[PDB]
Amino acid sequence: VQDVNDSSWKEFVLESEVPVMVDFWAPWCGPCKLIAPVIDELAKEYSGKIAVYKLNTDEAPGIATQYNIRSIPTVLFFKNGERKESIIGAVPKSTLTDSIEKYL
Template identity: 60%
Template sequence: MSCMASITDGNWQSLVIESETPETPVLVEFWAPWFGPCRVIHPIIDELAKDYAGRLKCYKLNTDESPSTASRYGIRSIPTVIIFKNGEKKDAVIGAVP
């Protein structure tokens, strides 16, 4: 079972940008269910979510279902993982890299 909650264009602002705990980093995986490499990194991010519970929020955003958020952040390759803190993009990893 996945530890990552799914987010959408509709709740992006409240969960990521205006997080109740802005000092807690938010990790977002931009993915699509039809793309194999996305399924490869899900278990890794799930493990991070467990290891950093309470210190890191982890979400996944399906780029097919929420294209406007993906477009706003210039997501052209999936999987892409972005870390946000205080509502701002801090770092990104593009592709299923080790």
């Protein structure tokens, strides 16, 4: 999964032509490791249909501040430049797929 930061956010996320799923994580976050596999898998499965990125809050806090993200793991969904939904915690693959499906 491609990393996204403060400098590529507008381009990669806000100007995307397809729905975007963003995974907010950090090296010290334990539960984050549990969803990492699920994120990579979904990115592959929906290639060409959605864009997936991961944002390390340690290196791009500016974005976390913009959307008022205060806890991780957090998964955000964007579509046409707008934040459509926020999910906190170790989300199961099935729940993420339900969301991906509604934005398609």
